[PDB]
Design an enzyme around this catalytic site. Structure first.
Site, PDB file in Angstrom:
ATOM      1  N   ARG A  89       1.122  -1.386   0.147  1.00  0.00           N
ATOM      2  CA  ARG A  89       0.189   0.220   0.151  1.00  0.00           C
ATOM      3  C   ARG A  89       0.811   1.575  -0.187  1.00  0.00           C
ATOM      4  O   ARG A  89       1.763   1.081   0.656  1.00  0.00           O
ATOM      5  CB  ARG A  89      -0.474  -0.161   1.619  1.00  0.00           C
ATOM      6  CG  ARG A  89      -1.925  -1.319   0.620  1.00  0.00           C
ATOM      7  CD  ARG A  89      -2.677   0.116   2.525  1.00  0.00           C
ATOM      8  NE  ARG A  89      -2.467  -1.422   3.504  1.00  0.00           N
ATOM      9  CZ  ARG A  89      -1.475   0.023   4.282  1.00  0.00           C
ATOM     10  NH1 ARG A  89      -2.377   1.150   4.287  1.00  0.00           N
ATOM     11  NH2 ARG A  89      -1.322  -0.699   5.361  1.00  0.00           N
ATOM     12  N   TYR A 237      -0.745  -4.653  -6.602  1.00  0.00           N
ATOM     13  CA  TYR A 237      -0.453  -4.919  -5.373  1.00  0.00           C
ATOM     14  C   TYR A 237      -1.712  -4.922  -4.228  1.00  0.00           C
ATOM     15  O   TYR A 237      -2.604  -4.155  -4.687  1.00  0.00           O
ATOM     16  CB  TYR A 237       0.378  -4.245  -4.254  1.00  0.00           C
ATOM     17  CG  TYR A 237       0.670  -4.788  -2.138  1.00  0.00           C
ATOM     18  CD1 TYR A 237       0.910  -5.045  -1.972  1.00  0.00           C
ATOM     19  CD2 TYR A 237      -0.630  -4.118  -2.020  1.00  0.00           C
ATOM     20  CE1 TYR A 237       0.742  -6.473  -0.994  1.00  0.00           C
ATOM     21  CE2 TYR A 237      -0.551  -4.765  -0.801  1.00  0.00           C
ATOM     22  CZ  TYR A 237      -0.368  -5.389   0.002  1.00  0.00           C
ATOM     23  OH  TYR A 237      -0.412  -5.720   1.512  1.00  0.00           O
ATOM     24  N   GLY A 238      -2.506  -6.232  -3.411  1.00  0.00           N
ATOM     25  CA  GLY A 238      -3.461  -6.796  -3.372  1.00  0.00           C
ATOM     26  C   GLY A 238      -4.586  -5.034  -2.547  1.00  0.00           C
ATOM     27  O   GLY A 238      -4.955  -5.177  -2.597  1.00  0.00           O
ATOM     28  N   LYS A 246      -9.382  -3.052   1.389  1.00  0.00           N
ATOM     29  CA  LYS A 246      -9.582  -1.839   2.470  1.00  0.00           C
ATOM     30  C   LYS A 246      -9.567  -0.979   1.910  1.00  0.00           C
ATOM     31  O   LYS A 246     -10.660  -0.629   2.307  1.00  0.00           O
ATOM     32  CB  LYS A 246      -7.380  -1.492   2.555  1.00  0.00           C
ATOM     33  CG  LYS A 246      -6.442  -2.577   2.557  1.00  0.00           C
ATOM     34  CD  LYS A 246      -6.634  -2.876   4.243  1.00  0.00           C
ATOM     35  CE  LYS A 246      -6.170  -3.858   4.930  1.00  0.00           C
ATOM     36  NZ  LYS A 246      -6.845  -3.706   6.806  1.00  0.00           N
ATOM     37  N   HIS A 266     -10.832  -2.826  12.255  1.00  0.00           N
ATOM     38  CA  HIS A 266      -9.741  -3.795  11.244  1.00  0.00           C
ATOM     39  C   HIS A 266      -9.767  -4.994  12.322  1.00  0.00           C
ATOM     40  O   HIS A 266      -8.649  -4.413  13.097  1.00  0.00           O
ATOM     41  CB  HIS A 266      -8.150  -2.446  11.300  1.00  0.00           C
ATOM     42  CG  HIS A 266      -7.500  -2.876  10.403  1.00  0.00           C
ATOM     43  ND1 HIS A 266      -6.380  -2.583  10.695  1.00  0.00           N
ATOM     44  CD2 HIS A 266      -7.119  -3.998   9.512  1.00  0.00           C
ATOM     45  CE1 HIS A 266      -5.193  -3.324   9.669  1.00  0.00           C
ATOM     46  NE2 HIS A 266      -6.062  -4.002   9.953  1.00  0.00           N
ATOM     47  N   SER A 288      -1.442  -3.258  11.647  1.00  0.00           N
ATOM     48  CA  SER A 288      -1.081  -3.753  10.533  1.00  0.00           C
ATOM     49  C   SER A 288      -0.171  -4.495  10.154  1.00  0.00           C
ATOM     50  O   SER A 288       0.151  -5.958  10.381  1.00  0.00           O
ATOM     51  CB  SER A 288      -0.682  -2.970   8.923  1.00  0.00           C
ATOM     52  OG  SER A 288      -2.120  -2.117   8.564  1.00  0.00           O
ATOM     53  N   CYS A 290       1.300  -5.899  13.101  1.00  0.00           N
ATOM     54  CA  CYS A 290       1.250  -6.568  14.339  1.00  0.00           C
ATOM     55  C   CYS A 290       0.662  -8.128  13.601  1.00  0.00           C
ATOM     56  O   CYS A 290      -0.637  -8.622  12.995  1.00  0.00           O
ATOM     57  N   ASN A 294      -1.848 -14.640  13.252  1.00  0.00           N
ATOM     58  CA  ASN A 294      -1.860 -15.871  14.567  1.00  0.00           C
ATOM     59  C   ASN A 294      -2.589 -15.910  15.215  1.00  0.00           C
ATOM     60  O   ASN A 294      -2.830 -16.526  15.791  1.00  0.00           O
ATOM     61  CB  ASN A 294       0.013 -15.545  15.000  1.00  0.00           C
ATOM     62  CG  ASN A 294       1.308 -15.161  13.815  1.00  0.00           C
ATOM     63  OD1 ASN A 294       0.543 -16.120  12.735  1.00  0.00           O
ATOM     64  ND2 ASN A 294       2.077 -14.525  13.805  1.00  0.00           N
ATOM     65  N   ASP A 313      -8.773 -10.099   9.346  1.00  0.00           N
ATOM     66  CA  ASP A 313      -8.458  -8.910   9.491  1.00  0.00           C
ATOM     67  C   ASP A 313      -9.569  -7.479   9.098  1.00  0.00           C
ATOM     68  O   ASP A 313      -9.821  -6.558   9.887  1.00  0.00           O
ATOM     69  CB  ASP A 313      -8.481  -8.455   7.715  1.00  0.00           C
ATOM     70  CG  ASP A 313      -7.358  -7.353   6.991  1.00  0.00           C
ATOM     71  OD1 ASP A 313      -6.957  -6.745   8.129  1.00  0.00           O
ATOM     72  OD2 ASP A 313      -8.037  -6.725   5.999  1.00  0.00           O
ATOM     73  N   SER A 402       5.209  -9.929   1.543  1.00  0.00           N
ATOM     74  CA  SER A 402       5.621 -10.728   0.437  1.00  0.00           C
ATOM     75  C   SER A 402       3.990 -11.870   1.100  1.00  0.00           C
ATOM     76  O   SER A 402       3.729 -11.550   2.695  1.00  0.00           O
ATOM     77  CB  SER A 402       6.123 -11.964   0.052  1.00  0.00           C
ATOM     78  OG  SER A 402       7.227 -12.196   1.253  1.00  0.00           O
ATOM     79  N   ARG A 403       3.070 -12.086   0.293  1.00  0.00           N
ATOM     80  CA  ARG A 403       1.691 -12.587   1.179  1.00  0.00           C
ATOM     81  C   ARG A 403       1.307 -14.113   0.521  1.00  0.00           C
ATOM     82  O   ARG A 403       2.056 -14.633  -0.270  1.00  0.00           O
ATOM     83  CB  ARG A 403       0.497 -11.472   0.578  1.00  0.00           C
ATOM     84  CG  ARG A 403       0.779 -10.202   0.390  1.00  0.00           C
ATOM     85  CD  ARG A 403       0.234  -9.762   1.857  1.00  0.00           C
ATOM     86  NE  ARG A 403       0.720  -9.279   2.655  1.00  0.00           N
ATOM     87  CZ  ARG A 403       0.195  -8.770   3.336  1.00  0.00           C
ATOM     88  NH1 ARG A 403      -0.660  -8.869   4.281  1.00  0.00           N
ATOM     89  NH2 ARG A 403       0.200  -7.002   4.614  1.00  0.00           N
ATOM     90  N   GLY A 525       0.773 -19.601  21.509  1.00  0.00           N
ATOM     91  CA  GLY A 525      -0.548 -20.090  22.300  1.00  0.00           C
ATOM     92  C   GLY A 525      -1.042 -20.177  23.458  1.00  0.00           C
ATOM     93  O   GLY A 525      -1.407 -20.528  24.066  1.00  0.00           O
TER      94      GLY A 525
HETATM   95  O1  LIG Z   1       3.815  -7.574  20.645  1.00  0.00           O
HETATM   96  C1  LIG Z   1       3.565  -7.235  19.753  1.00  0.00           C
HETATM   97  O2  LIG Z   1       3.748  -7.165  19.326  1.00  0.00           O
HETATM   98  C2  LIG Z   1       1.853  -6.783  19.780  1.00  0.00           C
HETATM   99  N1  LIG Z   1       0.668  -7.295  21.066  1.00  0.00           N
HETATM  100  C3  LIG Z   1      -0.029  -6.900  21.216  1.00  0.00           C
HETATM  101  C4  LIG Z   1      -0.835  -5.883  19.805  1.00  0.00           C
HETATM  102  C5  LIG Z   1      -0.571  -6.371  18.814  1.00  0.00           C
HETATM  103  C6  LIG Z   1       1.382  -6.424  18.959  1.00  0.00           C
HETATM  104  S1  LIG Z   1       2.169  -6.085  17.562  1.00  0.00           S
HETATM  105  C7  LIG Z   1       0.562  -6.061  17.976  1.00  0.00           C
HETATM  106  S2  LIG Z   1       0.868  -4.972  15.878  1.00  0.00           S
HETATM  107  O1  LIG Z   2      -2.115  -3.122   5.842  1.00  0.00           O
HETATM  108  C1  LIG Z   2      -2.948  -4.121   6.188  1.00  0.00           C
HETATM  109  O2  LIG Z   2      -3.316  -4.267   7.165  1.00  0.00           O
HETATM  110  C2  LIG Z   2      -3.456  -5.444   5.657  1.00  0.00           C
HETATM  111  N1  LIG Z   2      -4.140  -6.646   5.742  1.00  0.00           N
HETATM  112  C3  LIG Z   2      -4.057  -6.818   5.803  1.00  0.00           C
HETATM  113  C4  LIG Z   2      -3.665  -7.229   4.406  1.00  0.00           C
HETATM  114  C5  LIG Z   2      -3.079  -6.961   3.303  1.00  0.00           C
HETATM  115  C6  LIG Z   2      -3.069  -5.481   4.217  1.00  0.00           C
HETATM  116  S1  LIG Z   2      -2.917  -4.267   3.276  1.00  0.00           S
HETATM  117 MN   LIG Z   3      -5.091  -5.232   7.485  1.00  0.00          MN
END
Ligand SMILES: [O]C(=O)C1=N[C]=[C]C2=[C@]13S[C@@]23[S]
Ligand SMILES: O=C(O)c1ncccc1S
Ligand SMILES: [Mn+2]
Ligand SMILES: [Mn+2]
Ligand code: NA
Length: 616
Positions: A89, A237-238, A246, A266, A288, A290, A294, A313, A402-403, A525
């Site tokens: 972006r 780019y996505g 977005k 978000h 973004s 972070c 996960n 997302d 990369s994605r 976890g």
């Molecule tokens: O550690 C780290 O990295 C974190 N924590 C909580 C929430 C969020 C983060 S990156 C983001 S971006």
């Molecule tokens: O920047 C973002 O938060 C993002 N999140 C998911 C997929 C693409 C983007 S560009």
């Molecule tokens: Mn995002």
């Protein structure tokens, strides 16, 4: 729709359609398609049907033109490598168009707004006219009818994206619900008009790099909420080209949400079930940079607990007539950051992405597999690596942004209600940021108003030399569809909404380091222990103690069984000096960036925090 009248033969594009029929489109859809075809001058028009056949053939064709490569190690997975100028972006080339600037961003007291970029209506017409005329010459204009959210959900919204990129088509098939059934559901109703072009008409005027058409100098991602239009030029780019995500589902959607009584945020959505067979849904907003993905797919370490993923997302949420905050994931897939993804950090993603997945700017192994930094898995000697720059590799092998782009239905822990049209009832909302000092592992807001303040106050260490702690309120800084002060007021107003069951609000930090730089929390976890505490709190358990920043787990409340000694003293430590500085930086930030649009209640929460800190 019907044939345009004309004195000549330049307006009716029916003869250039290679799939579908202009005649069978809803009248306003034909006008949108045909009007942009007149403007962009594609060679062909392809109205996408969303079939597997279409998809398979489009991939093979991209393969034929050297734009993607099949990853033979996996089942129907594919790799694209981009021009290195088109990898992320571009915030400084992302704009929202409104009659008045203040409707889009607050007018700051002293500095430049960090909360959006406004462009005038007149400036945008000039910018459009300098980019789009003739831009698809020699190319196919694909027409992608799509739904954000489960088809027919009362929370779903439909778009039509026109694009000259097969890559965008393929990815939109994964990341949205796309094809003929959408057109049929749309009928004569309204839709968001999405226009994309890579900005490289044939014959090409400039060098094509890595077979990746783009126009970095003229890249511009524009949103016109009053016209219900998104218009994006120069990037494949996505985040710039998949307009549902977005552009639509945060920027356009957040403004619509304000006007209609709902929220577009978000946030990941997860469902958590405890050992007593009780299940709750939680939403979480982290920057973004972070780890939403996960957390959304977490494999919990605590026995008897289960986490299931609704989305990673974006969340669309509306309080229903019963007062429940119902949320949907408007997307259909995960567009995840590949580097750092391993069997240790996200085993469920590892499982998801080995089928029907498109990868972009990762490394390729000589046996047709994928590689990236942090994959934390050895390669058998003999197996060699081609970098994302299409060179032999022993600088990173994958681009840091990369994605993978993978179907949500393939996640082995996808929640059984991830597509329920009624949405899922959110009982907690988690904010968070990466903070190496001062901020505890978890705390809970004292009230709704305090919680909205906590959102607004979000800060996080930016990825690197020297470290910078940047503001990112609600994790929305790049994504606000409208004035942030008014967004604050919109969130505050939920407290006054009849019947509303306001979810508990928490803030997390997995990143706190001790006096010598030691991580105080093992994360991954083990973050299920934090979720356990939040679960109890939502059930009304008396497991909190009051501090100046809010509630924290009281002594022995946090489940540390199996962890050994944890330095909870340092992990939950609250320093007066750190918090005095913190509240000052928050003050300066809100005063400048929100200024005349800062709601009273948020100023009051600021004063109260200041006051609580002063009494330490
Ligand atoms: O550690 C780290 O990295 C974190 N924590 C909580 C929430 C969020 C983060 S990156 C983001 S971006
Ligand atoms: O920047 C973002 O938060 C993002 N999140 C998911 C997929 C693409 C983007 S560009
Ligand atoms: Mn995002
Ligand atoms: Mn109020
Ligand atoms: Na390429």
């Amino acid at each position: 729709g019907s044939m345009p009248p004309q004195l000549h033969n330049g307006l009716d594009f029916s003869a250039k359609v290679i799939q579908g029929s202009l005649d069978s489109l809803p009248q306003e859809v034909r006008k949108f398609v045909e009007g942009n075809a007149q403007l962009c001058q594609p060679e062909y028009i392809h109205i996408c049907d969303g079939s597997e056949e279409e998809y398979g053939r489009l991939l093979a064709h991209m393969q034929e033109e050297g734009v993607i490569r099949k990853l033979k190690k996996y089942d129907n997975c594919w790799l694209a490598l981009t021009d290195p100028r088109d990898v992320a972006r571009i915030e400084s080339k992302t704009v929202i168009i409104t009659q008045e600037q203040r409707d889009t961003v607050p007018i700051p007291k002293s500095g430049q707004s960090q909360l959006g970029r406004w462009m005038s209506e007149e400036d945008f017409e000039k910018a459009f006219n300098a980019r789009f005329p003739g831009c698809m010459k020699g190319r196919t204009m694909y027409v992608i009818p799509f739904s954000m959210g489960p088809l027919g959900s009362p929370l779903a919204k439909i778009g039509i994206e026109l694009t000259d990129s097969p890559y965008v088509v393929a990815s939109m098939r994964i990341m949205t619900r796309m094809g003929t059934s959408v057109l049929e559901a749309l009928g004569d109703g309204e839709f968001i008009k999405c226009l994309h072009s890579v900005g490289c008409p044939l014959p090409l005027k400039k060098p094509l790099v890595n077979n990746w058409a783009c126009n970095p100098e003229l890249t511009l991602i524009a949103h016109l909420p009053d016209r219900r239009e998104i218009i994006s030029f120069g990037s494949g780019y996505g985040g710039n080209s998949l307009l549902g995500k977005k552009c639509f589902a945060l920027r356009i959607a957040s403004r619509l949400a304000k006007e209609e009584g709902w929220l577009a945020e978000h946030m990941l959505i997860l469902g958590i079930t405890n050992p007593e067979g009780k299940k709750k849904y939680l939403a979480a907003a982290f920057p973004s940079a972070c780890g939403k993905t996960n957390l959304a797919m977490m494999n919990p370490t605590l026995p008897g607990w289960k986490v299931e993923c609704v989305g990673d997302d974006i969340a669309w949420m509306k309080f229903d007539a019963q007062g429940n905050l119902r949320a949907i994931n408007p997307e259909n897939g995960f567009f995840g950051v590949a580097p750092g993804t391993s069997v240790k950090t996200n085993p469920n993603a590892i499982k998801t992405i080995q089928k029907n997945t498109i990868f972009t700017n990762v490394a390729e192994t000589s046996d047709g597999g994928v590689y990236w930094e942090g994959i934390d898995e050895p390669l058998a000697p003999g197996v060699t690596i081609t970098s994302w720059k299409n060179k032999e590799w022993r600088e990173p092998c994958a681009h840091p942004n990369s994605r993978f782009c993978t179907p949500a239905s393939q996640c082995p822990i996808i929640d059984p209600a991830w597509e329920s049209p009624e949405g899922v009832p959110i009982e907690g909302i988690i904010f968070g940021g990466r903070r190496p000092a001062g901020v505890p592992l978890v705390y809970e807001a004292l009230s709704w108003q305090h919680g909205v303040f906590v959102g607004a106050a979000m800060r996080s260490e930016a990825t690197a030399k020297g470290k910078v702690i940047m503001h990112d309120p609600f994790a929305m800084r790049p994504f606000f569809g409208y004035n942030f002060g008014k967004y604050l007021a919109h969130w505050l107003s939920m407290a006054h909404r009849p019947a509303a069951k306001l979810p508990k609000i928490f803030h997390v930090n997995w990143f706190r380091k001790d006096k010598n730089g030691k991580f105080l929390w093992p994360g991954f976890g083990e973050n299920s222990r934090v979720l356990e505490w939040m679960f109890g709190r939502i059930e009304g358990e008396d497991s909190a103690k009051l501090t100046p920043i809010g509630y924290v787990p009281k002594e022995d409340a946090l489940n540390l069984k199996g962890l050994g000694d944890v330095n909870v003293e340092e992990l939950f430590g609250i320093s007066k000096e750190f918090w005095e500085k913190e509240v000052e930086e928050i003050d300066k930030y809100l005063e400048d960036q929100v200024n005349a649009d800062l709601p009273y209640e948020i100023e009051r929460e600021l004063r109260a925090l200041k006051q609580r800190i002063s009494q330490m």
